[PDB]
Amino acid sequence: PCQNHHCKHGKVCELDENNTPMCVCQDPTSCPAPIGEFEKVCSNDNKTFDSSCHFFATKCTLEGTKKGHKLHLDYIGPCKYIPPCLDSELTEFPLRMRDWLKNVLVTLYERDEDNNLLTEKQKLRVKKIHENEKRLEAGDHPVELLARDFEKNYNMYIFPVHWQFGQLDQHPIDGYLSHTELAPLRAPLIPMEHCTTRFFETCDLDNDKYIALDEWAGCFGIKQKDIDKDLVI
Amino acid sequence: PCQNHHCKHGKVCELDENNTPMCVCQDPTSCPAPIGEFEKVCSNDNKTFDSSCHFFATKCTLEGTKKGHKLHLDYIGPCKYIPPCLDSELTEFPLRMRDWLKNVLVTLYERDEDNNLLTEKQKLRVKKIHENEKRLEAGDHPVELLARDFEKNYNMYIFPVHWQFGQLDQHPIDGYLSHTELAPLRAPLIPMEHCTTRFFETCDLDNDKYIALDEWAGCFGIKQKDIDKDLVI
Ligand SMILES: *[C@@H]1O[C@H](CO)[C@@H](O[C@@H]2O[C@H](CO)[C@@H](O)[C@H](O)[C@H]2NC(C)=O)[C@H](O)[C@H]1NC(C)=O
Ligand SMILES: *[C@@H]1O[C@H](CO)[C@@H](O[C@@H]2O[C@H](CO)[C@@H](O)[C@H](O)[C@H]2NC(C)=O)[C@H](O)[C@H]1NC(C)=O
Ligand SMILES: [Ca+2]
Ligand SMILES: [Ca+2]
Numbered sequence: 001p002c003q004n005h006h007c008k009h010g011k012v013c014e015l016d017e018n019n020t021p022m023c024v025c026q027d028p029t030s031c032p033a034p035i036g037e038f039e040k041v042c043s044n045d046n047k048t049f050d051s052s053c054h055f056f057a058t059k060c061t062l063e064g065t066k067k068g069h070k071l072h073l074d075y076i077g078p079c080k081y082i083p084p085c086l087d088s089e090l091t092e093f094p095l096r097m098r099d100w101l102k103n104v105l106v107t108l109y110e111r112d113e114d115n116n117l118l119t120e121k122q123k124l125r126v127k128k129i130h131e132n133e134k135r136l137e138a139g140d141h142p143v144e145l146l147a148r149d150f151e152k153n154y155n156m157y158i159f160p161v162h163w164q165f166g167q168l169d170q171h172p173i174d175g176y177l178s179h180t181e182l183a184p185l186r187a188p189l190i191p192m193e194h195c196t197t198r199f200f201e202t203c204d205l206d207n208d209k210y211i212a213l214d215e216w217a218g219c220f221g222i223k224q225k226d227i228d229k230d231l232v233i
Numbered sequence: 234p235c236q237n238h239h240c241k242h243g244k245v246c247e248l249d250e251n252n253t254p255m256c257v258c259q260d261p262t263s264c265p266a267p268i269g270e271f272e273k274v275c276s277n278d279n280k281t282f283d284s285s286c287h288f289f290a291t292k293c294t295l296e297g298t299k300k301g302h303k304l305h306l307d308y309i310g311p312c313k314y315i316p317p318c319l320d321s322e323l324t325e326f327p328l329r330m331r332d333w334l335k336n337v338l339v340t341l342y343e344r345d346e347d348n349n350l351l352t353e354k355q356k357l358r359v360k361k362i363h364e365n366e367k368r369l370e371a372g373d374h375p376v377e378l379l380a381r382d383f384e385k386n387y388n389m390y391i392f393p394v395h396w397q398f399g400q401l402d403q404h405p406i407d408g409y410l411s412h413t414e415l416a417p418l419r420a421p422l423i424p425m426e427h428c429t430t431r432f433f434e435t436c437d438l439d440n441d442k443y444i445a446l447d448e449w450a451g452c453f454g455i456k457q458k459d460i461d462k463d464l465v466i
């Protein structure tokens with residue numbers, strides 16, 4: 001009778017006295033063992049957990065706690081040595097990753113089949129981007145080029161910038177990216193990913209430790225006037 | 234700032250957002266590792282836990298749960314093979330263990346020095362028992378003898394019967410012995426200990442899975458009129 005009951009990350013459904021479904025913290029050892037280093041995860045305390053399940057099981061007991069509020073999945077994989085974000089790389093990061101977005105969204109559209117990846121309206125949006133003679137092709141471009149393109153193709157970035165935020169705001173969906181939600185942006189694929197944290201600390205204007213839509217958008221150069229919640233969902 | 238804050242078994246003090254002490258479930262791996270098999274414990278699922286700390290840490294996440302309400306420390310030590318409680322042994326159990334109490338309490342008084350074991354009034358009580366010509370000496374006695382003594386020395390059992398209950402009602406102190414609190418009575422020392430559960434299921438009159446003082450006392454033959462809470466604390 002808990003089959004339909006989907007408890008959030010870190011918890012599981014156990015029936016209480018009245019045989020009613022209840023969400024309690026999952027036993028970290030009830031999580032499946034990791035297949036390889038790739039299933040492991042690293043917290044922001046530099047402690048490699050066996051898997052995000054294990055991590056979220058552990059972290060579950062800290063709900064409400066000041067310690068818990070701070071406990072976060074830094075990145076997927078085993079805790080690795082992370083190179084300090086050079087002052088240089090940091091200023092060049094926004095441009096580097098903003099382009100990365102447009103290209104990811106493009107390749108998603110190209111890989112999409114019967115909307116398995118992009119919804120209807122989303123595909124339409126990425127379509128206008130995709131088939132535009134002006135669209136700068138993907139490749140390792142000098143920050144200068146990436147910059148001139150941003151001005152010369154600003155409208156081409158408004159959706160990609162908005163999309164990524166939606167893709168991340170899911171733990172839970174509330175319009176804010178926690179340190180954990182930004183974890184995907186710390187994977188090796190991201191350009192100068194070691195700068196992700198440093199950078200996003202730059203975006204966290206009111207320093208609440210959460211990147212909100214306006215901070216995120218504004219951090220990527222998207223005019224506050226061009227921010228649109230409809231583009232996120 | 235949690236130093237003074239003593240959370241109950243299974244939980245620990247972690248500060249919440251307002252730097253206020255909060256009681257959250259303890260991380261079972263934060264428990265000290267067991268010294269030897271003797272530090273291990275066995276649950277009623279026949280699963281040997283690393284230590285009561287570990288067990289109570291695990292069980293902590295099940296508060297409220299029907300599964301949790303049933304999760305109990307069966308006995309201290311590793312899960313061993315347990316011999317069935319023969320009908321015979323069951324009827325003879327009350328007499329066997331009631332005597333065991335009087336003798337434990339006596340030897341405690343003899344081993345006491347400056348009240349390290351028995352409080353002041355408690356010693357006085359066990360003293361009147363100890364130095365009484367009529368007191369049946371310790372030894373393996375036929376159930377018949379143990380019986381005749383109970384009638385002939387009833388007053389000599391009222392305190393021992395009450396004391397033991399107090400010694401057990403500690404998780405928490407509420408006047409009820411849970412399956413876990415009765416664990417000490419499942420150790421090898423107790424006479425026909427394998428009959429402990431079976432027996433106490435007999436005492437649990439209103440079948441709530443808890444042995445209350447009246448059930449406990451009455452189960453050992455102590456008159457309902459001779460039950461005294463003052464003798465417990
Ligand atoms: C965080 O923990 C990781 C893993 O224990 C540390 O990474 C190691 O770093 C050293 C050099 O500092 C390298 O030689 C090792 O190869 C790294 N291990 C792995 C698995 O990559 C890291 O240094 C720690 N960082 C901090 C700030 O404590
Ligand atoms: C409960 O678990 C324990 C330990 O796994 C079992 O005890 C073993 O029992 C066998 C015979 O049944 C003995 O040969 C072993 O020596 C015992 N192990 C220990 C550590 O003493 C026990 O049988 C299980 N009981 C049930 C009902 O499942
Ligand atoms: Ca969020
Ligand atoms: Ca913020």
Ligand SMILES: [Ca+2]
Nearest residue numbers: 404405407409
């Ligand atoms: Ca109790």
Ligand SMILES: [Ca+2]
Nearest residue numbers: 437439441443
């Ligand atoms: Ca009862």
